[model samples]
Target: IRTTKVEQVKLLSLTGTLYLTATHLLFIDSHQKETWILHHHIASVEKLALTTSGCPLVIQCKNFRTVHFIVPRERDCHDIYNSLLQLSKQAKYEDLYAFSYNPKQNDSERLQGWQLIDLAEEYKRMGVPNSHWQLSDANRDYKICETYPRELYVPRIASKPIIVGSSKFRSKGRFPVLSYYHQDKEAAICRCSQPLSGFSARCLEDEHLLQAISKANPVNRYMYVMDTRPKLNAAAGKGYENEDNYSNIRFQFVGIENIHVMRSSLQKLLEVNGTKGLSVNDFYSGLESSGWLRHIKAVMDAAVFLAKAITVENASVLVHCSDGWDRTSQVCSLGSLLLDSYYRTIKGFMVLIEKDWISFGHKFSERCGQLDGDPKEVSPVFTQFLECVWHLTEQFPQAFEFSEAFLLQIHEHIHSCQFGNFLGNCQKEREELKLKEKTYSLWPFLLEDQKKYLNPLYSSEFTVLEPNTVSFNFKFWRNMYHQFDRT
Candidate 1:
């Protein structure tokens, strides 16, 4: 499988002879065991000084393969670094793969004997590398989250109760699916579902969705439906009208409200980049202080309360926000993390994303402005949640299975288009992008460099979310806020 390539470096240890081309990186061991790294899978290239192992250069792939070489002649290190770095960034995984997919006019073609890697479109594709966002489903009818067997889930439809809010502001699906322990289907946890914070309930259909939730898990007939808004919207307000039709249940709003997200926040941020000599204070105080971080803490506090209530009090809750994607998704996703151990770990965290965020319909592409390149569409909802997780990890260093490095990497990639992450609105929408036929995704890059981001002190055994003790530090703003040029 040799090609016309540049002969870069050679080592006698394991009979290493390195070769690289515009498209690939190849090295053979003593027994001809080939270590192949295509330029597309390349995440980053690093140069090492002296190591105990004697190798001075390492080429890291996003899929977790490391190529270490001695480069006995020093300049070779710089040469290899520049050569591969250019290829990784410019060659682009999709462009390289697209070369082979060319078709002839009126010609029948088919892909054969080619194995596709990492086709799953969950979080990384949407720019959340560690976010594993896929709803577990036995069949395609209703996308059910697989984390809990025959347990709480976001169902496909709600036969009863008005679907709440206009079709435009739907929080996806109609009713709230309750998650119960595998053994006990009756006792449930609290997962409150609501419309985006302002809209008023139009009729009885919305009330029907509210009343039917308790019937899913009879032990907890009281579905504690909470909203992040301090004052519930008209739809939310009417649903809890103390009418006998829905009087059997309770509707409580989480105290602190989120700033009504509108064009103003994105406008402030976009201007921060385009406007001359504008202070980041306009952002920290104007947009971020009022919008991004504050809302995250509010949603987190609300969700954590629900999680704590259900875990300790044997109750069930349903959460909803403006359209159910922004602050709503934040609280649900974060709350689920506090309650589920799998969500607390690295891989498990992905599941939380799949179920709570993707499965429930977080508008990833639109929210990030990934497709149309509309700067106005970009939002910090995903970024804010990651910061919340980092803060939690710091509070209980031994609680999570991953480290701060992992969280930091998440913030880094969510904004970069280097990978096909943060591009589409939902799993179904990404499926339309045909990720399997392409080679772009941010996950492999993060997966390839897992150890680099892993926390030094992470314990996988402890699963319960012991809350509120972890103080929220305003200082983390430095990570994203420091280079406040806002560009």
Candidate 2:
């Protein structure tokens, strides 16, 4: 459908003709500038009251841009709204744009992003397969933990029976497996789900598995059981581990909010950011009420604490939330970003995400709302992780190899569905879908445009980054929120 006399309400008003296609809604202004709106990218479409000028339409996109349009004809407005409502509801997984995306660039320019993580090689880099840990193929078929990737690094002393029994005791078959190893301190970060210790239920093998984790660190007699949930929230998730029940384990509750709370928090944040003519006091109050910055600080603080525990205290840490994917991935990856200099590099950053977030079974498709699912399943877990990284970048500009633009671009593409990397819920799902064989990687596209993402101030003199998490220190990411419009 093509219609004349369409107007776009932007900072500067734009007059255009609206064109609707099978996949996109295109607005071409008088100067030939085009605004393309992908059907699946539309988060919400609201029809405002009819005005003498036309009927008002406001479209909010998953990429955090809110577009305003005025249609001259009432019928066109009603028809467009209905069409978008139907088209935007992406029901089929195979219909995602990534499967059909083909790069126009040279073959040499493309990267095999799926091959980014050489599991054994990464473990070797961490100095594993030593006297303490071994990279085992016990999850070769993903039989133990379907959510966990193949090839897990376990304590050398943990036998197959112990690993299997531990998986049975842990939530979602996620037994404690090595997440990161600090070569200097011989300390490790192992992540899994909260133990099935509800009603004081305990499994002997699970206790033994944790004991083996503590033994892996030569310098430390004691390790921490870092539960990302609050102590009170632990009761709802079967239960958390009791420090006394496990050998050499100290329990610490990191207290990051769950997905449902985060989902609502982000909604409030978007309101505070997107609303026009909001008074300064109102904006700040709404922002505070959203609990967005506080959540960001909590995640960052946990990462900082974990890094300090491994580095200064030389103690291994066992990390987990309910399923060990959402908050667990955030702290583990962010803490590794602080402790290791390699992950701060561009390629290394890609590898870091692939290893910790992607391979560890973060529900990307559901969390991002890319398909038909319970709306409650969506959360900003990955975005919060990036925000923490961006917070660090602001404090130590020269420490990171990528610019703020790099992070912003990543935020955009996750919703854009132009790449295969962030498509599936877990490793098993992605492999089953043959994403590597069918689609393009976001890595290659970003890599090809290195000049755009490279941090000019970055230098290799890297150290552990520790940023203050005071409320005053948190700044609104204007680039991410105010991309299209200004008051």
Candidate 3:
């Protein structure tokens, strides 16, 4: 009879009972040849449970020999050992070995290998010394882990989500494919299936395309396809085909020399179509009308447009110009900032500037000196374009918690270097030429405030609204006298 409390019990063979107590296993021999004592240290019992006779008993301990003890007193000891041995031989015992070898079950082991490689690369980038071995806390007697590399190696899991916006529109039969991603399937369906309410449907020239898109699938919601090349002239009958198909879609016509004709055509289209025909050039012109304040107003108009569109539609709006680049890019970037303000919690806006915009105007000025060699200096105007957008965001009172890293990058190019160099080099020349120039300060105060607001590291104290709490009322600004004032 086993006397002590059995923490673990292993019937080694029918000859004896190898039962493990709290500290050690006691082997009671049937012949009573002075019970063999196997301490956990000296003679460890490798196979605790019993096994089938015909099947080979595989001992899986680190250091052990295979020794089959013959069954003695088969009647008395055999019953105790055989019962335990049969239980151990059941399918349930095999499950433990199955789990040990299963790849999915060994997630930590799999992750360990990948994490080691990732940490090594990160260390290399960070310029840390001996970063290869710095992965583990235990070392072969190293003083400190000081030499380890520490570059910003964020382990971005492939499973994690990243928001991506549309590219330049491409035509597929009648409908346009604006973006390609997992979410694009949903956006494409929404774009193709949903019927435009009221006068929005009348804006499209192709009734068949409109019906096809409206009846396609509800998944095409975020997909926005526009005519990249729109001709406003009556001679170009193709204008109506592209522009007047859907209320959500906009046609972008690049480099229109005749603003009057374009504006007239847009007005006619809006009047005939029974809804607004938003023109990128007209919006640009409206901002330009305000002189030095053009960029500021442009930002405000973008914000207003985004707020209204998102409030009405419950999704993003598509703004485009010819080629779906340049001016369209500017509008999209600014619009993204505004939408970002509202959808702060939902990881809303993304700007793929490389694919979206033309790197012209001021950026060209930086490389070539002067904005296309204009007698009248317009570089100051271009410099403040982004500044104005950042400034207007401040009016929302806890809108976007601007990223300092992003601001610093922009500042180095636009403000500190490009703007400074242009102003300094041209100051003496402009004086010598006796040119009448308006001295405008391209340095933005709003950017300064934003930088201050976003300074603290790892702090989430921002006052932005939660994702579902945002509700827009067009009547929100109706009572104010100067509705655009930044009070």
Candidate 4:
């Protein structure tokens, strides 16, 4: 399956020679222009009917890049399709390109990205571990919550027994843990799964933990519980927190849709973006129907609200969705980016992702569909988060130290499967797989080309950013969606 004569449907009049490898699919056209597509990056492959001319094969990528090829012989076409399909779906934890990749840097240089986010240093920057707040290593063995990181920032008053009790009360043992703290306002953002308060059931320790979170915020007597699901949806799923059971807390349903909704929206987005010859009216209508920008706006809206509540109102917010991974990570990361100036920098952005998304467990392998799994679990949750960040950078160009190209690179590499950073579902899983020693980190590679990712319009002044989250205010991120198209 190494060499074959084929014509790329998109590149008319240009017959190309296709070369297949274990990791990549290479195509060289008549003019000798090369196209390299990674196997792990492919989302799906479709075999169209064989016309009298040739047999057509459509390759759909996870990054939304579409490739079409027509083979002259039907037998060769079927062989190529089968081989490409197998290669694309051959992703395994150990078989990734990251393990075999050899860079110019030494072992120490490769490990630098793994150490980019020290949980202690991040909390220290936010003035944590004070008299009221304390760091707990209860989850070090991953007994409490497998999805949560080893070191947890909990309230000093929350004892070991209380922690255990709260863990049982919360969904999947994901008890509320401190995510970010506002040094100036004495506010904080804690994230966890919804309460197991199905049909008004409650745990005293869970209630106490919520109170402790509020108490830790010294000046703030009342806190906001930002539920990232619609009210009806949360109730139907048996995951909503009871406002009456927990006192002195303002419960607000942020009403962001679930993973299924997000997944379908991205599909619709791909359909609209990938289609070329649609009428002006049809294109705009299709884009509107896709609801891609709508979801992006919803995420930004929640994060902006969180930033305002923390900075202006001097209040702490506890964010949670169904499992506390998808929507929770989105708003929390974006909110942190809004409130903290450090997250807008190149290294800071990587640390932000490492801290919030990687350590906290955003299900990278599942969400990005890197390996074989239930298709229902696949969604663009992290992609939407990056899109939200890109929107922020667009509005406040000077505020961020990185450019749009940096975001595109991150987006591309998430599906590339060439890094140990986004390998497994959680921190514990990554530890189990020995990803640190086995593979190279994406950060070192990106950092090697630091100047290219830097924003020319960046400014050093740090201030609170409040971007308008209206749908009309958002624009299509051409750099990301039309990445495969010529500029």
Best model per lDDT:
2
Q: Whole-model Cα lDDT per candidate?
A: 0.52, 0.85, 0.30, 0.84
lDDT of 1 by residue, 212-234 (tens): 44554456666666653334541
Q: How many backbone overlaps does candidate 3 show? A: 25
> What's the true lDDT of residue 52 in model 1?
49
Report lDDT (Cα) of residue 350, candidate 4: 87
Q: What tens digits encode model 2's per-residue C-alpha lDDT throughout 1-487? A: 8989899997848788999998899999989999999998999999988999999999999989999999999899999999999998858767888876776745444444555557678778888888888877778998899989987899998888899899998889998999998887789999999888877687998999998988877899798977754444624344578767775778777888888888899889888888878899999899889988889888888898998898788899988877889999999999999999999988788889888988899999999988889888888889889888888899988999998888888888898898888888889988898877777788767877879899988896546776777678887776765542343
RMSD of 3: 30.8
TM accuracy, model 4: 0.80
Against the true structure, candidate 3 has what lDDT? 0.30
lDDT of 2 at 451: 93
Better of 2 and 3 by TM-score: 2
Best by TM-score: 4
Tens-digit per-residue lDDT, 371-483, candidate 3: 33432222232223344444543344345445434443444444332222123222223233222222212122233444453533322432212121122211111111111
Instruction: State how far residue 325 of model 4 sits from its true place (Å).
Output: 0.6
**Residue pairs in clash, model 4:** none
TM-score of each: 0.57, 0.79, 0.31, 0.80
Instruction: Provide the lowest-lDDT 10-residue window in model 4.
Output: 228-237
Off by over 4 Å in 1: 1-174, 178-212, 228-243, 255-293, 373-376, 469-474, 482-487
Which is the better candidate, 1 or 4, if ranked by lDDT? 4
* lDDT over C-alpha atoms for residue 170 of model 2: 88
